[PDB]
Amino acid sequence: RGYGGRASDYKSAHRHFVVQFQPFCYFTNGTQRIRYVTRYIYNREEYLRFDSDVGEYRAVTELGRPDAEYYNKQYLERTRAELDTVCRYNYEETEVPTSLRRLEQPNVVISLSNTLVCSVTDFYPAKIKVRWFRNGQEETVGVSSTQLIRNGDWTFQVLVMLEMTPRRGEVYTCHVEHPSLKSPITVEWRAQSE
Amino acid sequence: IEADHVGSYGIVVYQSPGDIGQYTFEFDGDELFYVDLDKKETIWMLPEFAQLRSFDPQGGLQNIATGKHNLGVLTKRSNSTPATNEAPQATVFPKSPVLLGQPNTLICFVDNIFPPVINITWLRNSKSVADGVYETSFFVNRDYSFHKLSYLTFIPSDDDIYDCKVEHWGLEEPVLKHWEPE
Numbered sequence: 503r504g505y506g507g508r509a510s511d512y513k514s515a516h517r518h519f520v521v522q523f524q525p526f527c528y529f530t531n532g533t534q535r536i537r538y539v540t541r542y543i544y545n546r547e548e549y550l551r552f553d554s555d556v557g558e559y560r561a562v563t564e565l566g567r568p569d570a571e572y573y574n575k576q577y578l579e580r581t582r583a584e585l586d587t588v589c590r591y592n593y594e595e596t597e598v599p600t601s602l603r604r605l606e607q608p609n610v611v612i613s614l615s616n617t618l619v620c621s622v623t624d625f626y627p628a629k630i631k632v633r634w635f636r637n638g639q640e641e642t643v644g645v646s647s648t649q650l651i652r653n654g655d656w657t658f659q660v661l662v663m664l665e666m667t668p669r670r671g672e673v674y675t676c677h678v679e680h681p682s683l684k685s686p687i688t689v690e691w692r693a694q695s696e
Numbered sequence: 697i698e699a700d701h702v703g704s705y706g707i708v709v710y711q712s713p714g715d716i717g718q719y720t721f722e723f724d725g726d727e728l729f730y731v732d733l734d735k736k737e738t739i740w741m742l743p744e745f746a747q748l749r750s751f752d753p754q755g756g757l758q759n760i761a762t763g764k765h766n767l768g769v770l771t772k773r774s775n776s777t778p779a780t781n782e783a784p785q786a787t788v789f790p791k792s793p794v795l796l797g798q799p800n801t802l803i804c805f806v807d808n809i810f811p812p813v814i815n816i817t818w819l820r821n822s823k824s825v826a827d828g829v830y831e832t833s834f835f836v837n838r839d840y841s842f843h844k845l846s847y848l849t850f851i852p853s854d855d856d857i858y859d860c861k862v863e864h865w866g867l868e869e870p871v872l873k874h875w876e877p878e
Contacts, residue, residue, distance in 0.1 A: 504749040507721070509706030512762045515769040517778040518865075520811050523708040523763065524836055528699035537697065544770040545779040546810060546840035565774055588705050596749040597703065600742075601723045611793045615878065621793040627724070653791055653803060654832050654845035656726050656742055 505595040510540060510588050513577045515569055520545050527589035538585040542566065554585050605682040606657055612676055612691040618666050620676035620689070623659040627681060634664045635675040668693035706755065707836055709812060710763030712771070716813065717763060719756035720833050730833045731756030741832075781866035782810040782841055786873040788860050794852045794877050802848045802875060804860030809834065810841035811865070818848045819859040819872070852877055 510525030522543040529536055542550035549566035550573065552559050559573040559581075573581075608625035612618055622632050628650055634641040644665035651659045662676065670693060678687040690696065701724055709718040721728040729740045731753045738753045740746040785808050791801035806816055812834040818825050828849035834842035846860065854877060862871040 503747060507705065507749060507751045509721075509751075509755040509759060510704075512706065512708050512759045512766075514762055515766050517776070518711065518713075518811050518813075519767060519771045519776070520709065520711045520779050521763055521767045521770055522710075522836070522840065523706070523759070523766075524840075525704055525706055526697070527703040527705065528697055529701040529703070530699045532700075535699075537699065539697070542766075543840055544774060545777070548840065549770075565770070568773065589703065592703055592705055593701075597701075597723060599748050600745045601726075601728075602701075609792065613793055619793075623792045651789070652725065654726075654805070654835075655791075655847075657791075659792075 504599055507592050507596050508588050510584055511580070513542075513573060513581070516572050522546075525588070527585075527593070529589070529593060533590045533593050536585055536589050538589050540581070540584075542569070552581050554582070557582070604656065607682040608678055608680050608687065610676060610678050610687045610689045612674070612689055612696065614695070616666055616668055618664045618674055618691055620662040620664070620678075621659065622662070622676075622678055624653075624657045625659075625680055625682065626657055628658055629681060630658070630660055631679040632660055632662045633677045634662060635677060637673050638675075641674075704836070706759055708759045708763045709834065710760065710767050711811060711813070712767060715764065717760045718812070718833055719760055721751070722835065725835070727833055727835065733757065733760060779811045781864075782808050783866045784809045784814065784862055784864045784871070786816075786860050786862050786871050788858070788873045788875040791847075796852050796854075799849060799851055802850055802858055802860075804846045804848075804862075804873065805843065806845070806860075806862055807837075807843045808841050809844060809864065812842045812844075813865070814844060815861075815863040816844065816846040817861045817863075818846070819861060820848075820850075821857055822859070 512523040524541040526539045538554040540552045549563045550569045559570050561567045561570040606626040608622045611621045647662040674691045676689050704722040707720045719731040727741050736753050738751045787805045831846040834844050858875040859872045
């Protein structure tokens with residue numbers, strides 16, 4: 503099912519050594535605004551770039567000086583058209599049914615180590631909110647969250663630590679909101695131990 | 697640069713000596729697939745996605761052949777200026793909270809990789825393991841070094857300890873990033 507994707511086309515120029523070609527389709531509000539940039543790199547030096555907001559190839563450094571005229575002559579119209587034939591096409595035909603539909607619900611677990619840890623794992627996409635509550639009110643002092651952790655497998659995790667005193671009759675709650683959830687998840691910990 | 701989404705449709709990496717190539721697609725920083733250039737096959741990270749879209753691997757072979765050519769041209773052009781090594785950095789963390797009874801995955805994230813040639817392996821109790829290991833391709837970074845992740849499935853236990861070992865040219869000795877359950 504679905505469609506065959508189309509690659510950005512890496513254009514031909516007229517001790518360890520490396521080239522890289524890096525194409526980028528930047529999408530804002532769907533395909534309403536698209537910026538397209540292709541980066542020509544020698545070892546880690548980006549020497550030549552196409553940028554749709556500029557409209558043509560530009561030498562970024564002197565290693566790209568011998569290329570920018572030949573590229574603009576030889577490759578420009580095709581390259582320009584990639585904003586639609588690569589970016590818009592791949593997005594509308596292929597990402598829509600796959601990446602943009604992906605919704606993975608977080609797993610929420612409280613553990614000790616005194617520090618309570620709210621671990622919120624295996625979720626997608628990135629947008630998340632995770633708050634600690636003590637006896638019904640939001641706790642902010644002594645609370646630290648990691649940055650978003652990318653697991654590399656199409657899921658994320660975030661860990662939120664609360665530095666605490668495990669008094670009797672004290673109730674702690676981790677509250678989580680995510681696009682995959684109709685309403686927030688809440689998980690409780692009671693002293694002693696949940 | 698700034699957007700709601702970023703797709704990279706055809707990252708080419710081509711290196712010498714060795715004719716070492718890598719061909720990938722990324723979306724929002726995750727790997728859609730790589731093209732296995734020896735098998736001439738599109739290898740999807742989420743097999744589910746492969747049932748909903750496709751990519752003809754000849755698109756990877758074509759763009760790699762352009763890489764082999766641009767490398768020739770740019771190497772000579774630069775007066776054979778070689779790549780300068782970096783020292784890669786490793787972090788080990790579990791995929792989910794570590795609980796006895798519950799199979800889990802240790803992740804070794806390695807960043808600042810340049811050039812993109814590396815050996816990441818796992819040790820369980822200071823001995824080599826090849827069972828239960830998976831690794832990603834090299835992901836691009838804004839500064840044009842790379843990151844890569846490796847994975848070891850494991851049954852949590854208070855008897856076991858772990859290391860992710862990283863060998864790279866930019867290292868005077870292998871990194872051993874140690875991990876244990878508390």
